[PDB]
Amino acid sequence: SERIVINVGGTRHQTHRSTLRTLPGTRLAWLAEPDAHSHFDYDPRADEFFFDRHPGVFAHILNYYRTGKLHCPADVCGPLYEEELAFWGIDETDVEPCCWMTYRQHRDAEEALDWRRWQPRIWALFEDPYSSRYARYVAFASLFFILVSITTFCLETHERFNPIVNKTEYYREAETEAFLTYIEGVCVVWFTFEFLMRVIFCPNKVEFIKNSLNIIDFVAILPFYLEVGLSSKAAKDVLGFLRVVRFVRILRIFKLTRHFVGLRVLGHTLRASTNEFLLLIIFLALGVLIFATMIYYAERIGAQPNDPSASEHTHFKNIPIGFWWAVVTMTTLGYGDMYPQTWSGMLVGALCALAGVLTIAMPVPVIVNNFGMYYSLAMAKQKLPKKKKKHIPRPP
Amino acid sequence: SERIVINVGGTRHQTHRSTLRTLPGTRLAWLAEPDAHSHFDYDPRADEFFFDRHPGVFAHILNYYRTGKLHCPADVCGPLYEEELAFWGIDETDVEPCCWMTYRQHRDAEEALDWRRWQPRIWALFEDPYSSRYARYVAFASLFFILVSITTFCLETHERFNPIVNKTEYYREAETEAFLTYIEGVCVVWFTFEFLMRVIFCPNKVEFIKNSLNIIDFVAILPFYLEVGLSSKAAKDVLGFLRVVRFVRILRIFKLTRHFVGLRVLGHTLRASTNEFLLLIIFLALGVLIFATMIYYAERIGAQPNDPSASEHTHFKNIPIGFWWAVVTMTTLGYGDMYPQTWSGMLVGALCALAGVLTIAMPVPVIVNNFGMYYSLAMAKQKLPKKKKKHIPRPP
Amino acid sequence: SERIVINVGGTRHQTHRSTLRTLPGTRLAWLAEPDAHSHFDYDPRADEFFFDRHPGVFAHILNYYRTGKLHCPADVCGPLYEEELAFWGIDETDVEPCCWMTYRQHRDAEEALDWRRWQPRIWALFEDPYSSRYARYVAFASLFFILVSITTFCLETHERFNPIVNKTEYYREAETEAFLTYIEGVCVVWFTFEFLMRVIFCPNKVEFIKNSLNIIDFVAILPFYLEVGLSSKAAKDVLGFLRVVRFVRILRIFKLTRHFVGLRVLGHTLRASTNEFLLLIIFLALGVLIFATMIYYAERIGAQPNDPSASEHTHFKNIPIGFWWAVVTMTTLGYGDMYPQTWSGMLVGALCALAGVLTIAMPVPVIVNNFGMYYSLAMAKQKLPKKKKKHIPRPP
Amino acid sequence: SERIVINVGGTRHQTHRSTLRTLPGTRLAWLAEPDAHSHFDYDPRADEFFFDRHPGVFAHILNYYRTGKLHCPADVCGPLYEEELAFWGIDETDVEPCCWMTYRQHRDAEEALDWRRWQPRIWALFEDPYSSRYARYVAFASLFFILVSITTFCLETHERFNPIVNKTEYYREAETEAFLTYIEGVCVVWFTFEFLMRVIFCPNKVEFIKNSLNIIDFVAILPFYLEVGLSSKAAKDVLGFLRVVRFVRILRIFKLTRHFVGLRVLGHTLRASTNEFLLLIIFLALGVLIFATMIYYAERIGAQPNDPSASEHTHFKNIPIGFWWAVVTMTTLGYGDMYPQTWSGMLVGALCALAGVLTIAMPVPVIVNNFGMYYSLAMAKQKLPKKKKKHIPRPP
Ligand SMILES: [K+]
Ligand SMILES: [K+]
Ligand SMILES: [K+]
Ligand SMILES: [K+]
Ligand SMILES: [Zn+2]
Ligand SMILES: [Zn+2]
Ligand SMILES: [Zn+2]
Ligand SMILES: [Zn+2]
């Protein structure tokens, strides 16, 4: 009586019907019921129910039945154990929190990593470079032209290319060389050609507009074409903000680097580590505030009485200056523009440096481990072939 | 004779009665006794004792019986093995020290992470914000007002808001703008209202006073109300310390940040890593002392004989200055306010930098791993539901 | 019917013939075929096929048959599981990507770590030092002479050894002491003797010339012998580049350090971490470009209007200067030669420091783990004896 | 025929006699011999040999017999597997190098962590403090006096305590205050009393003299007693070196800190990581040399032709100065005393910073992991009780 032998994949597990009867509604519970001969596959010769499943984890499932706490067997990948407990009817939200973060690890990484006749050829200039030959050619050319645009920008901000002429009308200002403007015009011509080509075919235009890359491209090409458009009074304000917009022209490099792997992995890491980033920012804000206040008060202890101002010989004339020093000191950067100059200030400074090392090394390893797991997974999915589907599943 | 077969969860383990007889007092030992048929469940058909336990670890328990040294099977979470050896009667303080720190890991993290009718509504303003709607409103409002207080403080210490008027009576000093004092008064009104509301209901007033948060709040609200109270001779000394007390007014931010998770995890990490913090401080103190002495003596080797003082061209005029330089250099901060200027000094400086990297990277990874484990456990306990108790335990 | 029992190494596995029939062409599939009695070893007494293999992993192989996804059992080294699935006929390119990077780990490290009578004695001066006594003597002597050459170089570039004489013909320049030239001549004599000795025996001269070490040695000995060779007009240009060539004379130290272990491990690590190095360089290039642009624009917000130039009080007069500052700040180096001096600049600076910590700590741990695995493997292969071949394989 | 069933701890392993016959001389080989019934325990009823050993690893041992390569089962602590293969007769130097460094890990850490009536009371003042009450009192007192000595030293080197009097005979020099000399005398009296007490009982005087602590103590107490001893001509030279000896007086703090745990763990870590320290020093030496040469040559590219010296506007006037800069820059210290000032110099500087991060992060993690393992083991051995010997071994 009350002695039932479960045969899982050729391994016999024996236990009392009561242990099965503990957790109701599950398949093993239904085994415990007297109406079990018809319900499940069973042979009267050996009085054992036979299940064609992995036994090595059914050990742990039956253990959960026995003691009452479900654990993750640390010798199997999380998804395998997940699929087994899914078969057995066990809810996967019962595992102990001590063994949940390692269980839900592979699956976590997996989820985090996740006219008309010539239209295919039109769109083939925006598809992946390796997906064709025209695609790779257009990609190389757009790369060259983005780099030329960026170099034109960086050299336009230079002094050697911005001499000031003795021109009065009586204001004299630096002017840019004509060659820079001409190269900029050429690059604008090329980008406008590419943008019109992409606009030709825009399926699901809502998601096309939601695409940040196209937004950045259009915003980057917007200021130049405003040369013809430029009331002169509003025009000066819009030119003033137009320089600041032209600042975005360096963001066109992400269009090129999007096809890199490490950058997609970095995007997934960032989007998947919001909590740790907020944690790091909170830690840094508390540290900066506290240590700025402490150093501002410490450096006044040795202040000379003669001076009318509270602090004359110290860089820490107020607290916000303390914020700047505290960041520079906690990140172990240490420019040396401002540093403590009193024994009390030096004590506070050493404390700030150590606390900075600690509260920077708290969340950063979490973020780094996330990136490491996602990068390893992406490199795996890259090295392995796409799909072959060698397994031919049996009919139900 | 002396050949006994133990059936654990449907897996047969065979061994001689002597091996069981080694460790006395334990349940398996009692099995070895001839009065075992009545004592334990047993069938004469197969001459095997049947125990309804996980077999995969009973392997290791019987191995401890065989050889004499108990180890932790590295394929099961620590608590599972703990519970099994608890059932078998084995003392859990016998495992080898080589396998103790990994065994007692999940359990370690677990332990480290651990009138009257309107009184519930009164206290609901101090309860968690998400626990109600009034609670969340009061929390947002107290957040806004704490931030306004802190900004008032930081701007009061500024120069632009502390001009010195040409007022004599004949001493001229900077005075704060009236708007700052008025905003401070408003914030004091709000905090005093909140403090009276919390004082209304104070169960277990001993633990309420032992609560550091309420202490900080009351100490922070103490200086302002002393405006009316302010002998003028004692009053000047108490105002002088009152500024230093007002320095704590920034500590009211912990009241807000207490509901964050990362901060509670950080508190548990700190309170659980006292030994490693003391170790780090000892390492740094030895390093600082030794390297300060070494650099002070090194920089005098090349000292010019003409100068009457021992050191005129070196920043290292004595040893404590060496302490400051040694900290700044060992933490790789390197302000550049003081640095070696002699070949001997440069050798000592390079040694200090390397030794600093090493003796800072010794204990810090221990602390960081503690924080990582506790944070993963807290995030697990957050993601999983609270409790369902699906398991229905069998009657004893 | 359709119930087949596979006996692997004395452990019975039971499953239906359909599960075997899923994946065709494999050995277990052939078992499922009715012509299996003759094909494989089998006894009619127990109706079980017997395979003399490790059972602990055949569990996982049969599980792959059952569910359809192949995983790596995390309790066995990768090569053992590889060899088992090789025996069973399973393709090793089917394992899930979630468990591929840990599977292909030991094997990855393994692959990454991988006249005539007196000619043996001639070549024995270039063989390993420990491989003979003459070898060790010649190695010590060449070490002493390489070190003397390097010290001669470093002292020749010094000022104390380059006084300028009052010599006109009317140009006065610093000249090197005669002792330096004589020591250089002696070292050249020794290196030319060693080079002729090595040239005596040069098997597979194509690979001898492809050897970078011999290239470096010959290029290093080339400039001195050009003293006799030195048209005077071309001679001045070749001397000018000859100083730059003599710069390589410090590269002769790699000849000595090649016999060290850590350096060979470092070479394997570098050659095996090209992807992560390119990733790090891409991350740094994007960060440097973006933050240089941001700081250059930020520091102009507070620019004084009086000055004709856009920036007079800021170190960031253009963007490339921004590149230099951005590198120095992202690596937490922080010289202090140039730093932000405006509240906007300070915000951008703090962001640059944090982003630098993050995008430097992303790929560097990958590279460090590669080096750690390869170094542990090399130290293992060093500590273990070379080979004994105690196993005597059975005849097929 | 040739089918033998080994029963290990109640688990049947089946294999052919040939597989056992492969590796000769081992116990399983002797099983394969026809004279096996008498040699080993065996029952003719089941034709199985019974061994009372852990089966879970005998799987791997028999696998070594089968394939020919021995691996470490990653689910058991190294010592358990070691003891099993020791029983089976397998040599423990056969495991593959891929699985040797993790196998020999716990054992590695274990090895690395390893008149007359009143003489016990005499020596009880040098024994551990907690080992008695007199011991703890003497320890606290010696701690106070060592700290007083160290503070006296550090203040004696100060300026405020070394005024120069207007004393001629006509040389004026700073003199130390009398209170410092008196406190030094008191501390010398106490240390000499303690040293005589320890000298009273010195068993195995060779090892007592080999003890570095007693050496340091005696050398530290040597200079003061030379006050009476101080030819005046030799006396000045010995006083000059006596100041340098007195420099060691700070080394008396190790006597106190020896009873700390982290310091003993650090000593074991250092003594056990000689190879990685030499590796780090080699890496740093190569990096420093190469980058110093590179920066010295880079900074001359933009050198102004007017100046007679090769370099006037650069800090890098020669190569050794380059060594100093290269260390300060590779350790990310970055004082800012010397930095590149030419675009070529800036490129070399960025390369130096990155290469420094890499070649410092190569061996340091190895050293840190060693310290982590040893510290965890020491904390384990501290938390667990000393010894109980509950296991009563069976007679052979
Ligand atoms: K610095
Ligand atoms: K740093
Ligand atoms: K730094
Ligand atoms: K600096
Ligand atoms: Zn668990
Ligand atoms: Zn163990
Ligand atoms: Zn997997
Ligand atoms: Zn292995």
Residue numbers in the entry:
A (entry chain C), B (entry chain D), C (entry chain B), D (entry chain A): 7 to 120, 169 to 223, 235 to 295, 299 to 464
Study authors write:
Voltage-gated K+ channels of the Kv3 family represent an important subfamily among the 70 different Kv channel genes in the human genome, with specialized biophysical properties to sustain high-frequency firing of action potentials. The combination of ultra-fast activation and deactivation kinetics and high activation potential of these channels are key for their ability to repolarize the membrane and terminate the action potential. Like other pore-forming subunits of Kv channels, Kv3 members are comprised of an N-terminal cytoplasmic T1 domain, which is involved but not required for Zn2+-mediated tetramerization, followed by the voltage-sensing domain (VSD) with transmembrane helices S1–S4 which is connected via a helical linker (S4/S5L) to the pore forming domain (PD) of the channel. Here, we present cryo-EM structures of the human Kv3.1a channel in an activated state, providing mechanistic insights into the modulation of Kv3 channels by the cytoplasmic T1 domain.
To elucidate the structural determinants underlying the biophysical properties of Kv3 channels, we purified the shorter α-isoform of Kv3.1 from mammalian cells and determined cryo-EM structures under different sample conditions (apo, Zn2+-containing vs. Zn2+-free). We achieved 3D reconstructions between 3.1 and 3.5 Å for the different conditions, which show only minor differences in the overall structure, and no clear densities for additional Zn2+ sites other than the known sites in the T1 domain16 (see Supplementary discussion). The polar head group of the lipid is stabilized by interactions with the imidazole group of H212 in the S1/S2 linker and backbone interactions with Q409 and M414 in S6. Our maps also show densities in the selectivity filter which likely correspond to K+ ions from the purification buffer.
